[PDB]
């Protein structure tokens, strides 16, 4: 499969979904941050902090504009990078859900071997695996394989690439 850099659109979708504790389906893309949160402002400041750490600069009043406009504004200065904290979010995902012997290097080289997805797709499949957090000890290595197999299928169905 051809190496493609991670899209800014699916990154914003994953960060906002993963922070609000919902599925990636339940967050529509044509939606504002004030729309999704509502009256609650505690999570507003840490969401705006998660946009300001991931890309660096943000447009003015980013909470009152759809995530479509944020995706097209951020993609212009965004090139394949995983930011800073989203590498600590997948580090927390595999040290708490993935079992022993499931280091990123082992899951990365395996889904490069079997599936054939390069580093630009590996990022995308790890972000899809984070968005629908299993919230369960995946002790069985093989059940955790079926997990990343179902998350490589979800990434393939979203982006629109045959496998």
């Amino acid at each position: 499969i051809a190496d493609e850099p991670v899209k800014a659109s699916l990154l914003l979708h994953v960060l906002v979904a993963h922070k609000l504790k919902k599925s990636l389906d339940s967050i529509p893309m044509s939606k504002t941050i004030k729309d999704l949160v509502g009256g609650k402002s505690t999570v507003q400041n840490e969401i705006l902090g998660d946009l300001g750490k991931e890309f660096g600069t943000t447009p003015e009043k980013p909470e009152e504009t759809p995530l479509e406009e944020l995706a097209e504004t951020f993609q212009d200065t965004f090139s394949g990078a995983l930011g800073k904290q989203s590498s600590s979010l997948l580090s927390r995902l595999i040290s708490s859900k993935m079992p022993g012997g499931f280091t990123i290097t082992v899951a990365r080289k395996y889904l490069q071997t079997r599936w054939g997805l390069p580093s630009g797709r590996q990022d995308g499949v790890l972000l899809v695996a984070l968005s629908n957090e299993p919230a369960a000890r995946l002790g069985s290595e093989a059940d955790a394989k079926a997990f990343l197999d179902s998350m490589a299928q979800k990434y393939a169905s979203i982006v629109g690439v045959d496998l």
Partner: protein
């Protein structure tokens, strides 16, 4: 004689030099700790797993303290004392634990809960080692206050800051158990006694108020909807504020009275005013609990009687689904409304109050700012007002950048607050008499002589010590009935504000910061460890830090950017500004103008007068044509004079010969001092090329919108040493012009621009003298709009210089220019329709 003792967690390690006389006992814990310690992993990103050597020594301190008994002298006291002392010496460089915690967050890959664990361990260790905080700290802030270089004011927030306040109390019981455990246990026992004394109290507490059971075991905690109900939330928000006060008093070693004395004044927002008076009573650690009792007793009787005056009722599902579908919150008795003036909101409430009967009428309850209001009333009546508002607002994803400012549809927000009772409204009035009858039964008075510091009234902003009658009757009256004029009540002069209230960064402090930006007031959020990336307001670490970072002044724009006079050896007086200091000429520039400044004879004549002027790239079509113009400017200016170039960004044909020609000419050392890119702002990578490769002194950028101003900020942040000239004009300019007001975008962006000291902020459009410009030099221009003064670094004069002797404009065109009467700023937008003051707007190619 000391033996090394290594304790480790994978890669990260620490070696204690423990005396051999206590090595056998200290070696014991090293394996038990390493048994308790989980399996070392990559990155240490798992929970309950130390990330840095500091956290590890922390986890050890925590584990050792868990075995030490305070009452009985144990064998482990000796091993605790030297591992604590080692941690202090090797990490706390004379500083506080909160400064360490804050350092481990922004450098290391440590998450918030790990630092919260570290703090708890260190503090528990310190109290278990029988080493209470009795030595007064050397915190930079309280040193400064002693000297008289900083005045503190303690503000206490109230309701509506968070739907999840109770977890803020849980964090205090977890992290600072030892400091506030006794306070919390006292308040819980006080509240339980007040339930058994008041006749119908038990009716209101359906799931009880056993707050010790809810803190020890999270699962037995009731749902957020119960916790939000005022009879719980009112006293408990009181406790959280007092717990944050106590933690601050204890970790600085002060008594409450000493800490209260160090404050110039103290006020609070809504029920926060009860806690602000409660501390102004206090003195010694032994006489604290009598002030606390009064405070908790007031908030309990407000909570109970204000619930029995207006209990929340089930809301029709039709209103709920309409609200959620149309992207509002769950309706509540208090509606927040941003970005509308109070007169505007008062119109929209008069519309709604005209139809409704007396006992269903909304009213403005809080003025939290110029344009930040909270309406209180029945949740339906506010959903009524919310429909009226939705009808009269623009869609949030609308592009009005192409519509003249004056005709734009005003865009605002309106959300329901996470509160459960309409505070500061006619609906709670029946409770007033009942509350006061109950405070006199429980012998809960505040007396004016006992209040050591001034306590500012939320209505009129006056001190409560000068009040005639009962102060408690005025506190009740200011919470349940009278509105809160927050900008009136925070008129006090202070360099620092301590926000103890709940909500942390979503609390009263950050709102007060917004309201005071550029007046040289630093808000410190006293109840939250965190890191502000902007660093515009402080966090809990600032209070306890002993280095300079503790005492951080927020800029006062009037003083920071004061225009000054300065003379050179010769005698020539200059106006000194950020801009004139750089270029060593008056802060007045004639901008690039096609065709006024395409002439080399005018660019020479304005350079020779000693003023900066851009040669206009708009009037040249090749490098040879511009090279020949420039050569004519250099042949006409004096030795060591300079000038600039204006290249149009929307003309990519001009840029592809323009930029290489500048690069070439600067390599030959032609006196091109700067480049202005007009008609659009470059991208970061193109700007980064222009800044690095052209060998320029500065770069002019003429943003049109707020989006463009953000792109200038971003360019300046990526090259923090290179000077950027942000030449701001409104739509009232000559030539190609935007739709934008000259004032409104600067009012919004001034603060952000000023965060970047390499931006020289130049003002243009509508200037022709020293009288119209002066209010922008001195910054008084922004006082008309109720903002603090916003001084500018320089001015540009396009239209004004078009009838000068040296301009190539034809004599009949000069007479035609001079015959235009013009118009003032408020009329200019008429140019879109008809000839306004001799001038009209037309579309280009």
């Amino acid at each position: 004689s000391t033996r090394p003792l290594t304790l480790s967690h994978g890669s990260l390690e620490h070696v204690l030099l423990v005396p051999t006389a206590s090595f056998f006992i200290a070696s014991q814990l090293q394996e038990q700790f390493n048994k308790i310690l989980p399996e070392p992993t990559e990155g240490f990103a798992a929970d309950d797993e130390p990330t840095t050597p500091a956290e590890l020594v922390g986890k050890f301190l925590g584990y050792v303290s868990s075995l030490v008994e305070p009452s009985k002298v144990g064998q482990f006291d000796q091993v605790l004392n030297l591992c604590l002392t080692e941690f202090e010496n090797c990490y706390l460089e004379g500083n506080d634990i909160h400064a360490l915690a804050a350092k481990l967050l922004q450098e290391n890959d440590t998450t918030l809960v790990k630092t919260k664990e570290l703090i708890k361990n260190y503090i528990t260790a310190r109290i278990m080692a029988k080493r209470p905080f009795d030595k007064k700290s050397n915190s930079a802030l309280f040193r400064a206050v002693g000297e008289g270089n900083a005045q503190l004011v303690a503000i206490f927030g109230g309701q509506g800051n968070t739907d999840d306040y109770f977890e803020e109390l849980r964090d205090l019981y977890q992290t600072y158990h030892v400091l506030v455990g006794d306070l919390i246990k006292f308040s819980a026992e006080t509240l339980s006694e007040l339930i058994r004394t008041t006749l119908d109290a038990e009716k209101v507490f359906t799931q009880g108020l056993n707050i010790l059971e809810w803190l020890e075991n999270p699962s037995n905690t009731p749902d957020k909807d119960y916790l939000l109900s005022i009879p719980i939330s009112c006293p408990l928000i009181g406790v959280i504020q007092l717990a944050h006060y106590v933690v601050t008093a204890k970790l600085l070693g002060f008594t409450p009275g000493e800490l209260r004395s160090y404050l110039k004044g103290a006020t609070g927002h809504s029920q926060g005013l009860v806690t602000a008076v409660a501390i102004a009573e206090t003195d010694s650690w032994e006489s604290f609990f009598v002030s606390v009792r009064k405070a908790i007793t007031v908030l309990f009787f407000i909570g109970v009687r204000c619930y029995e005056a207006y209990p929340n009722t089930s809301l029709p599902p039709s209103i709920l689904e309409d609200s959620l579908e149309n992207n509002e919150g769950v309706p509540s008795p208090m509606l927040s409304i941003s970005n509308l003036t109070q007169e505007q909101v008062q119109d929209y409430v008069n519309k709604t109050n005209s139809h409704l009967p007396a006992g269903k009428q909304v009213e403005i309850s809080l003025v939290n700012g110029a344009k930040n209001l909270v309406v209180s009333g029945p949740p339906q009546s506010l959903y009524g007002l919310n429909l009226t508002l939705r009808k009269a607002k623009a869609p949030s994803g609308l592009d009005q950048s192409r519509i003249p400012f004056s005709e734009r549809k005003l865009k605002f927000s309106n959300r329901f607050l996470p509160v459960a009772s309409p505070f500061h409204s006619h609906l709670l009035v029946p409770a007033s008499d009942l509350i006061n009858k109950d405070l006199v039964k429980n012998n809960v008075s505040f007396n004016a002589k006992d209040i050591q510091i001034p306590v500012y009234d939320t209505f009129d902003g006056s001190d409560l010590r000068v009040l005639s009658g009962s102060i408690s009757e005025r506190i009740v009256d200011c919470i349940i009935r009278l509105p809160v004029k927050w900008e009136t009540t925070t008129q006090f002069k202070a360099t620092h504000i301590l926000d103890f209230g709940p909500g942390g960064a979503s609390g009263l402090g950050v709102l007060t910061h917004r309201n005071k930006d550029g007046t040289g007031v630093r808000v410190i959020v006293a109840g939250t460890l965190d890191i502000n990336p902007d660093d515009d307001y402080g966090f809990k670490q600032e209070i306890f830090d002993v280095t300079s970072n503790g005492l951080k002044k927020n800029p006062n724009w009037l003083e920071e950017y004061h225009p000054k006079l300065i003379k050179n050896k010769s005698g020539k007086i200059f106006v000194e500004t950020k801009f004139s200091k750089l270029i060593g000429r008056p802060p007045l520039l004639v901008p690039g103008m096609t065709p006024c400044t395409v002439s080399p004879d005018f660019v020479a004549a304005t350079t020779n007068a000693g003023y900066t002027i851009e040669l206009a790239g708009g009037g040249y079509f090749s490098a040879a044509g511009m090279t020949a113009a420039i050569d004519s400017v250099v042949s006409q200016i004096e030795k060591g004079s300079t000038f600039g170039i204006n290249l149009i960004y929307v003309n990519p044909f001009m840029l592809q010969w323009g930029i290489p020609l500048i690069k070439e000419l600067r390599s030959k050392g032609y006196p091109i001092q700067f480049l202005t890119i007009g008609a659009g702002v470059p991208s970061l990578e193109v700007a980064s090329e222009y800044i690095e490769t052209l060998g320029l002194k500065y770069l002019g950028l003429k943003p049109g919108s707020i989006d463009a101003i953000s792109q200038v900020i971003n360019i300046a942040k990526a090259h923090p040493n290179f000077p950027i000239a942000l030449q701001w004009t409104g739509g009232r300019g000559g030539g190609h012009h935007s739709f934008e007001d000259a004032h409104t975008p600067m009012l919004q962006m001034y603060s952000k621009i000023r965060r970047h000291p390499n931006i020289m902020l130049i003002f243009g459009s509508g200037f022709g003298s020293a009288d119209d410009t002066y209010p922008y030099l001195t910054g008084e221009w922004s006082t008309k709009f109720d903002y603090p003064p916003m001084p500018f670094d320089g001015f540009l004069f396009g239209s004004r210089v078009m009838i000068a002797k040296e301009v190539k404009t034809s004599p009949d065109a000069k007479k035609c220019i001079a015959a235009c009467t013009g118009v003032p700023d408020d009329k200019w937008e008429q140019t879109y329709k008809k000839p306004t003051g001799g001038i009209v707007t037309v579309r280009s190619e």
